[PDB]
Amino acid sequence: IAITAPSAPVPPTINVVPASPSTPSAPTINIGIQPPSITPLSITTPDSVDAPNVVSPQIKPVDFTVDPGGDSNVYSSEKHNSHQGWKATWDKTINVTELTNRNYVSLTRDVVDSTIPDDQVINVTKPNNRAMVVDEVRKNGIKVDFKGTINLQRSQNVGIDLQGTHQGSISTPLIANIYNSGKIIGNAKYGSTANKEQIAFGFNNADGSNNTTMTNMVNKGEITLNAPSSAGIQLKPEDPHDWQPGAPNYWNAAPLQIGNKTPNKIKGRVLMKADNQKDINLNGSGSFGMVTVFNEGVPKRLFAPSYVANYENLRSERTYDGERVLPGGEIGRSALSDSKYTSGVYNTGNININGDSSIGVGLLQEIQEVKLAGNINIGTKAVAQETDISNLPNAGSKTYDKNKVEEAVGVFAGVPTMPVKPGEKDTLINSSGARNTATSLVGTETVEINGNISLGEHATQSIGALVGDTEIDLNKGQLTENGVNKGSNVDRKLKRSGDITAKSNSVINVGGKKNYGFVVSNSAHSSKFGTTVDSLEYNVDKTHHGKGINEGIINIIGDESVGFAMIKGGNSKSSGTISVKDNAENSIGFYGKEDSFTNSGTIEVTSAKKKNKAVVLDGTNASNKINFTNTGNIYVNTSDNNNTNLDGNGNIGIYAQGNYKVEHNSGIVKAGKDVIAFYVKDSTGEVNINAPIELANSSKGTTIGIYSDGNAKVKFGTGSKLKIGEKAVGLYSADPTKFNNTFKIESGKTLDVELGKNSTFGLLNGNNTVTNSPLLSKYLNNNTSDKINIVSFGEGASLFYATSKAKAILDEDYKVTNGDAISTAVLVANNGANVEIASGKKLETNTNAGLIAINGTVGFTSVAKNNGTLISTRIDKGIGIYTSAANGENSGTITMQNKNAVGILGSKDSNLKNTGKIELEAVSSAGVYAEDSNMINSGTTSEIIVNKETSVGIYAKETSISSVSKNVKNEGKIEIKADGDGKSAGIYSKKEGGAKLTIENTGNIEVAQKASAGIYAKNESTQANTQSEVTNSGLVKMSAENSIGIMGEKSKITNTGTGTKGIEIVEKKSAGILVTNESAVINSGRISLSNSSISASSDGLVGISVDGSSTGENDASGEIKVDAAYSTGMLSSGGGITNAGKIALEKKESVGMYATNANVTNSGATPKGIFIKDEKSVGIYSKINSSSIANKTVTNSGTIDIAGTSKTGSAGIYSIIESGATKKLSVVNNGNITINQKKSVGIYAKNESSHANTESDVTNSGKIEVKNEGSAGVLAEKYKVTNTGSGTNGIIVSAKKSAGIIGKLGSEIINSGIIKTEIATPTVATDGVVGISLNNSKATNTSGGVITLDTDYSTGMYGEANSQLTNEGNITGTNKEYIVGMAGDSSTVTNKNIITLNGKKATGIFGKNSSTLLNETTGKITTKEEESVGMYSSSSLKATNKGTIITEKKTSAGMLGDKANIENDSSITTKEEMSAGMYVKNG
């Protein structure tokens, strides 16, 4: 009968206020690029010389004189012909015998001129004779024309001859003109006997004749000689000793005996002139056509043993009666100035030389004049060479040819010509020594030719014009050579050498094979006589004798023939052209070895043909100590200074091997154009250059003083003033494998060279044959002054030029402080070559560009490796190295100083390999730059560093040019130790094409300046986040707050990171993944930031942040790890957010999903979603402020979980609106949200003012798992709560002492759905459940929500501390006893709605603790179960009742007393059985 009631426990309150982080700002970016254009230089390619062996055949004596037998005793013109000249009638078969028998026809002392008609044929039967002799015919100008046929058969025979006369006068020399139209032939065989010394015409005499004798001969017939060593026309000076026959017998004795010598002033000085006016054909070998023999006197045949003892030969200077005749012989001086008294040699006809090793025209004694204007042909007639026909049996030596003529010579010079000078005193000498004079110059100074001298096609290494010596012995006489009198002792040799001059009228048409055009094989033997008899003085004189004076054209119609070839002799004066008439090959002009010959003339290649070389200067062949004392006139192939032609190419100035050097030390030297002075070979050749040079600007090609294939010991030294202007090149090379040792440079030998424009140190191709890379690190090496300094440049020039698979190394440091404009870059790699940058190299620059690489023919992979310190300091756009179709590699340090500087750049489908360290200490600069190519960072030593703001690291662009994917790879560490709050980035990606780009980082990236991040990409156009997507398997770390982690456009990311891999952020305000244009992420890996000391309020971070153009979402395997306090996983701004992975919360004051001005979505469910572990936090929380314009909300369709049997201090759903902000922030629940923690709240919203709460909205269309005791469903302060859950959705309150709905003062409590208590009956009394609880506030139950009570002793609404409770909603509860909905403790209660209940002894209202009730009748209670009462009073001094009670159920009562005694006066109808309104529990 003692009915009591329990008491509800006190509910908790929560105040969680998490952090308010912010979104960081992406930095601005982008830098331009400039490409350089290289200068289009020129090329030249020489080669070497094979074998210019100059074998010079020697001269041989031709002393083949016949005895002057005089008249005959059977046909004397006096006793048999009556002095009427030639007798017209004779026998056609006269058998002429030798001179001893005198069977020859003789004609002497005639007054009638006679000749021979055509019909004659005469042979010779014996040697040493004349078929017929026409002697002593002065006749003062005889003139006839011979027409008979003459034949030669034995040796020492004469075809026909007309000799001079002993009668004449000094002032009127004789004039002659003889014609000879006949045929003369000298054959090669006499049975089986050899034939030689057969002479056609000539001059010879034993006894003296008249000096004033002057004669002329005109050739008119056919001349043929087939005996080897024959003689066409012979000229001789007469003996000044004037040897005489055996007087008084004289010429009667047979053979002649020379019986006396009569030297005299006016004896032995005759004059002679010869002329060929027809065809001379020489078939014999080693012969003479027209030669001036040496005046040796006579062979010993006329020297009897009685007179061999007093054999005083012309082997000494000869003086008689006061004469001063030079040793060896002399032709007298002429003063009557006319060509008809000019005694010498001249020709107009033709000479046909075909015998092997023969002489065209020979000079053996000094004569008055030698000028030649005829046809000198050697080897132009094909003949089958045979023994004693045109060759001789070999003497164990060189074999003579059968079809070609070899060792043949044309002009032979062993002595010069000595004409009459204007001051010269003539030889017009009277008997008493009375002598005339001359007032002018007659004849040319030396050997002269004005006619065509030609070598035939059969000419093989034959000689055109030979300047040789003449080695003749001498008697016991005085000797003097370059010093004191020798007093004999040293051998006495007739040292004689001649000199030749030529004119363009004399075309030297040398032809055939390797023929020796004009070889000065002499020794320049210039000889003079002293003040006494037998006096001789010798020197190397370059004025008097033995020189080379060239003025004429030397026509090289054959191939690889040589002209002026130098074995010995010293100097010569060159002023005439030597040219190749055709496309002949390897023609060499100068084979020089000795004293400085002077080139006072041009020597070039005036033809399209090339590969023929100019001058070979090497060690002296036949004189001591390589006499290259070259300081004379050196004027070759240049554009000025005594040589104004530069035509052709392949011209050389120096060619040498072995013992050679150059010694230019005085005067002036002028270098050629498109010609190279130096080119040498082998491995031991040294060069000395110390003379200052003068240069003119280079030609269409390129000019350089020095070149070699890389194999010379060329040296530089101070003193040689060097200069360049306008498109020349300092160092030229086509073969760098050996070039490394070419130029040794010694300290202090700094060379001063100044340059114009379009120039370059290194021109290199390598000929695709670079076996060895030249270690070129010496020319401006930093160690010592063993450098070369060529600094004076204009603008538009380069340093090194690499083509054709060449290779070279930057020396050390070199700079060109002469312009940063176009065509001024350090070096260019062309045709796909490779160059190496050694470590420690310091090619600093201020110019336009550094290294440029471009591929032509591939050959070898286009790549250059950097190991040195490469820095640029150009004022604007200083680019370090560039590659096109070429791979860039570095392993050293690269920095930069000035603005807009650029490091390594690649393009055109290549890759970039980084191994070195790059630091960005400058501004407005990018280290590695790329476009339409690949790249990679190789190894952790590949270090990318930034030291200042306004600079970016990796830069790669893509386009529509190639639609194949590229890649951006990193294996090194990118630690950015920069400054400033931003303005710096590490890796940057661009695209405009239709392809896709792969970007992955496996190495490390770090940033130490604020507001900066490494990854950032351009993927703006219409595509998903998988084309320029960035995936990470590397490490993303940081060192400065306010910064950013992941940045970019349209990318998909995974956290492939374990250990020291992934993303690590330990400081403030540095978001992990901020995204633009819809980027997604896989969060399976390390997001362990370890920030804010996980318990300290010192930092604040965000895992992933999003913008309006993006929706941030996590992979289903995503593991978003809260390793920091006051941090966040999801930051949302404008765009959308959705979770598909796992989102935990391990640290304090964090949030998985935080949203600003954006909507919140969850799809991750079963078993995905949000799983909160730590406390003082909420899984998802979004807030907006007065400044927030976006009307956004929060949605739930996933799993949000936090649980705890001892954890508390948190809430399920959180969202705040700041006071005064009418922005309508709301939350909707439709997912799973477990609240199994202690004292938590499913949905929380905080208020700051009593404003109109229509903006804040709280609806629960989903489910809340209230299974943990003591917690609360939802709390709010002056906000609107709508219980929109129905059935298993919404208010699932299933815990003991737990609370469904509680509100603060003036809270808008609304019920519009299910309100179902815990189904489980309490395990102990008073352990019921409460739905509504109040504390000095107001609550509004609404009938729109159904309130269901199933826990025993549970309550629907609860109130305390003067709380005013308003009831308007439905009340339901069944299957349990008591379960009073209304329990009150010290409060004012008003009832408005009618209450219904089920269960035994169910009661609607229960009052406790001095509580009082107004007792409104409308708040009545409907009784459904038996023994149920409506009112309950317990421990209440105040009680008011003014209404009747209607009972309609059995055992049901009205008023009920509890442990008290109060009496009143009221009556209530008890019409039903046992249904009365009153009963008492106390007696």
Residue numbers in the entry: 290 to 1772
Q: Paper's wording?
A:
A pivotal pathogenic factor, the autotransporter adhesin Fap2, facilitates association to cancer and immune cells via the receptors Gal-GalNAc and TIGIT, respectively, leading to deactivation of immune cells. Fap2 is a type Va autotransporter OM protein and with about 400 kDa the largest single protein in Fn35. Structural analysis of the Fap2-ECD by cryogenic electron microscopy (cryo-EM) in combination with AlphaFold2 structure prediction reveals a 47 nm long rod-shaped β-helix with a matchstick-like tip that interacts with the immune cell receptor TIGIT and the CRC cell receptor Gal-GalNAc at two different sites. Thereby, Fap2 simultaneously acts as a molecular spear that deactivates NK cells via TIGIT interaction and as a molecular grappling hook that anchors the bacteria to the tumor.
Cryo-EM and SPA of the Fap2-ECD at an overall resolution of 4.7 Å revealed a total length of ~45 nm and width of 4.5 nm for the ECD. The β-helix domain is separated into two parts of 26 and 19 nm, respectively, by a kink of ~101° in the overall reconstruction. The 26 nm long, membrane-distal part has a thickening by 1.2 nm, which we term matchstick region. To improve the low local resolution in this region by eliminating heterogeneity through the variable kink angle, we carried out signal subtraction of the shorter β-helix part and local refinement of the tip of the longer, remaining part to 4.4 Å resolution. With this, we identified a hook-like structure with two triangular extensions. Although the final map-to-model FSC value was limited to 6.5 Å, likely because of the non-separability of the β-strands in the β-helix, the data together with the model allowed interpretation of several unique key features of the structure. The map and the model reveal a unique hydrophobic longitudinal groove in the V-shaped β-helix that winds around the longitudinal axis of Fap2. The triangular extensions at the matchstick region result in two pits at the tip, which are present only in Fap2, but not in RadD and are probably involved in receptor binding.
